[PDB]
Every structure is written in structure tokens, then in C-alpha cells.
Nucleic acid binder design. Structure first.
Ligand SMILES: NCCC[C@H](N)CC(=O)NCCC[C@H](N)CC(=O)NCCC[C@H](N)CC(=O)N[C@@H]1[C@H](O)[C@@H](OC(N)=O)[C@@H](CO)O[C@H]1NC1=N[C@@H]2C(=O)NC[C@@H](O)[C@H]2N1
Lengths: 97, 116, 174, 76, 137
RNA sequence: CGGAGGAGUACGAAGGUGCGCUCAGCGUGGUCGGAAAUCACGCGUAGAGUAUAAAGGCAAAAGCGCGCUUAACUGCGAGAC
RNA sequence: GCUGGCGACCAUAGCAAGAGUGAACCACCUGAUCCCUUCCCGAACUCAGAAGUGAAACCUCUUAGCGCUGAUGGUAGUGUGGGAUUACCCAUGUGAGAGUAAGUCAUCGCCAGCU
């Protein structure tokens, strides 16, 4: 409840190198949700929201709610990719919990 | 412990691989302190064409573990292989020395009529 | 010995070590006699004398041992003989052991030489002695200089305590 | 002056016939310094580790055995 | 004057410096660090000068970790020699720098003093740099 | 006239064959005898070797022994590089 | 349902640890006459056999402890066309390595012997 991330679905036409670069130029961040008893789900997040969430340490230990459309996934942040030079977040891995 | 059996299999490997490379029907023999066994196996190495051993009823009640038993097993495997239709074979001693009971079995098979 | 161990020592060892199955009982497998007669290059005769001494001490033909790898520090090189050795099993080793225990110990200069320590940690015991005397061999007349010898007893005893128990049962001094 | 400046003539090693091709008995399949490939059914080995066909058929490459060796064979 | 104790070969090819620094771009020893944002070459003299400046500023109150080591030798022709006649003689040693490469980390000092020391060090370097701090991920 | 190394030999066995065998290192004990000789037992291990430079290889070991030997033959040679 | 022999396959299969089996088979085992053997030794190889044992070894079972397998997503690289020159960007096609979730204490064929 403390951390809520608003996301849109990332369809197959929004996957790959070119689509991801277009998204990051549009100031979005691709992310993947995986974990027990279900199939992986690809979503896109807001860079502003992600940076705001990462500024706080309790984000890395609490359970956060990712909402895409009506469905809601309760996940924990699992991995994060950053740009080597600019330190900007580039991709995120979330684990169902 | 286990070194004796591993060494015997290591000695057997070369002859078995050469027989496979030649593609001949194999006459494999096996020896234990109590019994002797012989099989005629196809060139691909998967199907047993014939077999004979002291475990067979005709020989089981005897001494079953000496040269006299080995000669009977050799004659019997020769008869069964001839009945099955095998004429030319390559002998496989399975890492044992070609001597004693193994030699007697081979000689009995040759007398029975397996050409090798 | 031989029959002595076969009839008697097995039972006492079984009771003392408290082992359920009979195959666990310590059994002395072999005895190895070695003279590491180095520097044979300079003379070429002491090795012959050592071979003769081994042949006299043990009722068997000794085998010379060649070096492995060539060492600059000594004068040894890859192929030439630098030692002499014999292995004993069966009746021969039992006879050697009984002769050792019976006569070798009194004929050493200083008693209490052997130690209840000096075990390999796996049930095998090695002892080194000086001189070819204390055996039924020719005396200082008709023999070359005195030479030391290593005797290693390899037994089936799984542990050092079992090896010591078997050794005490056979009656070796310490 | 320099102490370098030497090299040997090329040896033109390599695979001569690839998988799926048809061969005639005697055709060289692989030129190799060592046994990078091993001889399978209907394939012979020369004194310099050359692999050649001993029958007419179709070349096939595979990996087999406990050591993971690379094998080439000719199917008739 | 950092330099390998031994090398398998004396002279190496020029090569091409391309790509980003995916390895060695995270803070792993100290709490604060300086990392390059532009590619280039870093010489042993430059490394030593930056280290001396940082150590003098922080007055040896903490630990400095140097994560760059110059292992690539660079040759030069004697002077007034024509082209050819073999490769030149080894003159100095460099480390290849890609964007994201962390150069120095500092442990056990206040952040303000560390930033002052890093600002002093950056003026000695031939490429642009930035300051980073340890994060969870 | 770029960066690094080797060759202008050796061997009648160091060739053929049948049979047979696994290296190196370390830790324990054991006369001289130790950092390191030889003996005995164990632990993880190809890091050994391959006449010689390097590379590609090497368990049916292509590495290492023993007995007998001369195929280190003669005439060729489908087919390929 | 167990035991032995020969193969397919070559770690999801292996290694390690714990446990279990002697009716048959196997293994250890007894002896060194004759066959045969040790650069010495019946240790190995070989022969003649059944007083013992399932201890060791081999097999079978259990364990994710090492090892091995391993996505999805993203990143690196890259063919073609265009734009720029520290060597990157765009369109299109392709797409690792590492890491993450996760999986694994194999799966089959022929012959013979017991219950
Ligand atoms: N693959 C698995 C291999 C496992 C590895 N070999 C460990 C092993 O088996 N250790 C045993 C163990 O240390 C000990 O055994 C008992 N029970 O205490 C010893 C004396 O019995 O025997 C060893 N084994 C032996 N096997 C050998 C043999 O036959 N000859 C020569 C010598 O190497 C012998 N020692």
C-alpha cells in the first residue's frame, strides 16, 4: 500500500532493442514480472515514479503493488539495470511475492 | 578393491572396440570362480544371437567351475550358434588371459565348428 | 606364528576390539624391507653388498630400485639403481616376523628403541634399524660395512589403535 | 635492425566436405593438424590425421561418446 | 608509478577503445567514488598525481582504493628516425578508460571532505568525471 | 626493415607386433638421509610425458615396459587435397 | 520383484553423505600339487575347491550438500539503407555472454538365472 507503481502492458510489438530505445526516449522503463505459479508479464513504468521509489530504502524490502489496467500484482523488486555512465535506471525485474 | 574389476574392463576395452570397428559377430566370454558364461552377440552389439553357460540344466549339477565344465560350455555354445546360423566369429576374452578355462572353451567351440 | 594367530590371536583380538563381523579383525598383510642405498654411483659395489645382505636376511631374491626423476642435489639420475627392496607375504613374512621378535631385539645394542608411536595413522607401522647384525647372517668377517634397513608392516587394521592392538598381540616389544 | 621477420608457408587445412554432401570412396573430408574430428563409420584415418571416405554415401557430423568427441561418418 | 612486475610480451598492438564499462562501474569497496563519464587513456603519472592529491586533501584519515591499473605498454620512436626499421621502444604504461569506469573510492571520511578531494583530483585528469555513492542496487 | 620462437637433425630401436602398465604433486609415518634419494599407506587430482620449437592432438592412451622380430618390403593403386 | 552379461545415451545421468541386501548370482574367501605367474612376492595373472562373511567391494534406496541443466525480460555485438566521426544515432532484420526465476539424485534395448 505504501508503494504503488502505475504500469501499462508491454505487447510483443513493444519488445526488442528498437522498441525499448523508443520507450526510453519516451521516458518510460521496460520491466518484467515473474515468479511462482504464473507466466512472466512484461510491463512499462514511469522513470519519474521509479526514481522516486528507488530514493527510499524501504522500497527494497517492502511488498509493492504494480497496477496495469485493473489487475494488481504484489511484487518485490528483484533486479535493476542502470546506465554505466549516466546511472539512469534502464530495466527492472520484479518477483511475485 | 574395485581396482581388479576396473583393470579387467580396461584390458577388455581395446579388443571390444576393435571387434566393433571390424563389424564381426562377437563371441564374448565371461569367467567367475564358480561359473563360466559365453554369448554370441550381433555386430551392432545389441542383440544376443546365442548363449551357453554352466547355469544351464545339463551342466549345473556338476563341478561347474573347472576346465571340464568349460569344454562342455564351449561345445554347447558351438552347437547353439551353428543352429542359429552363425559361422564366422571374433573371439572376445573380456580382459581375461587366453589360458586355462577360457582356452578350453575356445578350443571346444572351434571343435564344435565355429570358424575363428 | 601363522597357526598361532589363526587359532588363538583372532579370538582375543575380536574380544578386545569388540567387532561384530569376523572380517574386521586386524590381519597383517605384508612386510616390506628396504635399504635406500644412495650414492651407489661413486662405488658400484655397496649396492651388490646390499643385495647380498637382503638375500641372506630374507629367503627371497631382492629387487633393485631405480631412481625416478633426476636430482641435481645428489648424484642420482633418471635410470640408475639407488635402492634395494623386498616384499614378504604368507609364510615367509610370518617366519621373518617370528625371527625378528625372537632374536633381533636382544641383539640390538640399546633396548627400548622401538616406540608405540610412529604409526602411519591408518594402521601400518614402520621401524628403521641399524646394522645387518641381529639376524642369522655372516658376522663382520665376510661382510661389508654395516647398513641400516627399513621394515614397514602393512596390515588390514583400519585405525592406529587397532594396529597397536594387533602388534601387541603378536608381541613386538613396544 | 630487427630479429623478427620469418613465417612459414600456408598449409591450407580445414573441412573440405560439409554435412549433407555426397562423396565417393577416397574423397578427403577433413585436413587437420590433430584429431579435432574423429573417424566414424565408413571413414578412414591417414598418417597425418587426414579423414577420408572409404565408401560412397552422404557425410554426417555428430558428437558422441563419453568424452564428447566430434565424429564424422558416411551413410550409405 | 604502477607497472606490472612481469609481462608475457613486451609490445602490444594499438587496438581500438570502444564500448561502455559494464564491469567495474559499481561502488564495491568504499562509500563514495569518482567515475569517468568519457573515454580516454590514463597514464601511471596521472594516476599517481591524482592519488597524491586525494591523500593530501584527506590527510590520510581514511582509505583510498585505486581501481585502475596501467598494464598496456606504449612505444615511441627515438626521434630523427625514419619510418620502418621495426617497432619503437616502450616508454610508459596506460590503462584504457571507458565511460562508467570507477577510478578511485574513499572509505571512512565525511562526504564533504571526500567531494573536496575528488574535485581537486578531477583537475589532474584528461577526461570528464562524476561522483557516485553506494546504493542498494 | 610488423610482434615472438625454431630447423639444415636423431634412432636397427627411439621401427613392427602380441601381452602388460599409468603420470605429476601433496599430506602422514619410516637408519644414515636432509627442502628434495628409497619404502608403506591414503587425498584431491592430468597440473606429468610425448628425441627437439610452437600449435593442433593423445584412454583402444599417440605416454611407459617385456618377448619375438625386420612391413624402415617388391609391383602397384580406385579416388581425392 | 531381485541377480549377472552385453549395448543405446554420456552429468537433469555425476560426485558426496546416510541406509539395505546373501535363497540364487556376485564378491570377499581356502590351498600352491599339476597349467600359468612375479625385472622379488600366489599382491596381481592362473589352477584346484567350498570352511566361513555380506565386513570391504559391487549393486539398490534416500538427501538439493557440491556439481550439472536453465527460461522470460533487458543489455552488448551485428547484415542492409541513411545520418555523424572517440566511433555513436535512426529504420529494418538478427541477437549473445554473464546474471535472475526455476529444474535435476536419469531414461531405454537384448539374453540368461531365481522367487
Ligand atoms: N571410484 C571410487 C574410488 C574411491 C577411492 N579409491 C577411495 C577408496 O576406495 N579408499 C579405500 C580406503 O582408504 C580403505 O578401505 C577401507 N575400507 O578402509 C583402503 C584399505 O582398505 O582401501 C581404499 N581403496 C583402495 N582401492 C585400491 C585397490 O584395490 N588397490 C590399490 C589401492 O589404491 C587400494 N585401496
Amino acid at each position: 500500500a505504501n508503494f504503488v507503481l502505475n504500469a501499462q502492458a508491454r505487447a510483443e510489438d513493444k519488445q526488442g532493442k528498437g522498441a525499448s530505445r523508443r520507450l526510453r526516449r519516451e521516458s518510460l522503463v521496460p520491466a518484467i514480472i515473474y515468479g511462482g505459479n504464473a507466466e512472466p508479464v512484461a510491463v512499462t513504468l514511469e522513470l519519474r515514479e521509479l526514481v522516486k521509489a528507488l530514493e527510499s530504502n524501504v522500497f527494497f524490502e517492502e511488498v509493492v503493488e504494480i497496477k496495469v489496467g485493473d489487475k494488481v500484482e504484489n511484487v518485490k523488486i528483484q533486479a535493476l539495470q542502470r546506465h554505466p555512465a549516466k546511472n539512469t535506471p534502464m530495466h527492472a525485474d520484479f518477483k511475485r511475492a | 578393491m574395485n581396482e581388479k574389476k576396473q583393470s579387467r574392463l580396461r584390458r577388455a576395452k581395446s579388443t571390444r572396440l576393435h571387434i566393433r570397428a571390424l563389424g564381426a559377430t562377437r563371441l564374448c566370454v565371461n569367467r567367475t570362480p564358480r561359473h563360466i558364461y559365453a554369448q554370441v552377440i550381433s555386430a551392432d552389439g545389441g542383440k544376443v544371437l546365442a548363449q551357453a553357460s554352466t547355469l544351464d540344466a545339463s551342466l549345473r549339477s556338476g563341478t561347474t567351475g573347472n576346465i571340464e565344465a568349460a569344454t562342455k560350455v564351449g561345445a554347447l555354445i558351438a552347437e547353439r550358434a551353428k543352429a542359429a546360423g552363425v559361422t564366422k566369429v571374433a573371439f572376445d576374452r573380456s580382459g581375461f588371459k587366453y589360458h586355462g578355462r577360457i582356452k578350453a572353451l575356445a578350443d571346444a567351440a572351434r571343435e564344435g565348428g565355429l570358424e575363428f | 606364528l601363522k597357526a598361532r594367530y589363526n587359532d588363538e590371536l583372532k579370538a582375543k583380538l575380536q574380544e578386545e576390539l569388540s567387532i561384530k563381523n569376523v572380517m574386521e579383525i586386524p590381519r597383517i598383510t605384508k612386510i616390506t624391507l628396504n635399504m635406500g642405498v644412495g650414492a651407489a654411483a661413486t662405488d658400484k659395489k655397496l649396492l651388490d653388498g646390499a643385495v647380498a645382505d637382503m638375500q641372506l636376511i630374507a629367503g627371497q631374491k631382492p629387487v633393485v630400485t631405480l631412481a625416478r626423476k633426476s636430482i641435481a642435489g645428489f648424484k642420482i639420475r633418471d635410470g640408475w639403481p639407488i635402492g634395494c627392496k623386498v616384499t614378504l607375504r604368507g609364510d615367509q613374512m610370518y617366519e621373518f616376523l617370528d625371527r625378528l621378535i625372537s632374536i633381533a631385539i636382544p641383539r640390538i645394542r640399546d633396548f627400548r628403541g622401538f616406540s608405540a608411536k610412529s604409526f602411519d595413522g591408518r594402521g601400518n607401522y614402520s621401524m628403521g634399524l641399524k646394522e645387518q647384525i641381529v639376524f642369522p647372517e655372516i658376522d663382520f668377517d665376510k661382510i661389508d660395512r654395516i647398513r641400516g634397513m627399513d621394515i614397514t608392516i602393512t596390515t588390514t587394521a583400519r585405525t592406529d589403535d587397532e594396529g597397536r592392538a594387533l602388534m601387541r598381540a603378536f608381541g613386538f616389544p613396544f | 635492425s630487427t630479429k623478427n621477420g620469418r613465417d612459414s608457408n600456408p598449409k591450407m587445412l580445414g573441412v573440405k566436405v560439409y554435412g549433407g554432401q555426397t562423396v565417393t570412396a577416397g574423397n578427403i573430408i577433413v585436413r587437420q593438424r590433430g584429431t579435432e574430428f574423429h573417424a566414424g563409420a565408413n571413414v578412414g584415418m591417414g598418417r597425418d590425421h587426414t579423414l577420408f571416405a572409404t565408401a560412397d554415401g552422404v557425410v554426417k557430423f555428430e558428437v558422441k561418446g563419453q568424452f564428447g568427441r566430434r565424429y564424422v561418418k558416411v551413410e550409405t | 608509478m604502477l607497472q606490472p612486475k612481469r609481462t608475457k610480451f613486451r609490445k602490444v598492438h594499438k587496438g581500438r577503445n570502444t564500448g561502455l564499462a559494464h564491469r567495474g562501474s559499481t561502488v564495491s569497496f568504499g562509500s563514495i567514488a569518482i567515475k569517468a563519464t568519457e573515454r580516454g587513456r590514463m597514464t601511471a603519472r596521472q594516476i599517481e598525481a591524482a592519488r597524491r592529491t586525494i591523500s593530501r586533501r584527506i590527510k590520510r584519515g581514511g582509505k583510498i582504493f585505486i581501481r585502475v591499473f596501467p598494464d598496456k605498454p606504449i612505444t615511441e620512436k627515438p626521434l630523427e628516425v625514419r619510418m620502418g626499421n621495426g617497432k619503437g621502444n616502450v616508454e610508459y604504461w596506460v590503462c584504457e578508460i571507458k565511460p562508467g569506469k570507477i577510478l578511485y573510492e574513499i572509505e571512512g571520511v565525511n562526504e564533504d571532505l571526500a567531494r573536496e578531494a575528488f574535485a581537486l583530483a578531477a583537475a589532474k585528469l584528461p577526461f570528464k568525471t562524476t561522483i557516485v555513492t553506494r546504493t542498494v542496487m
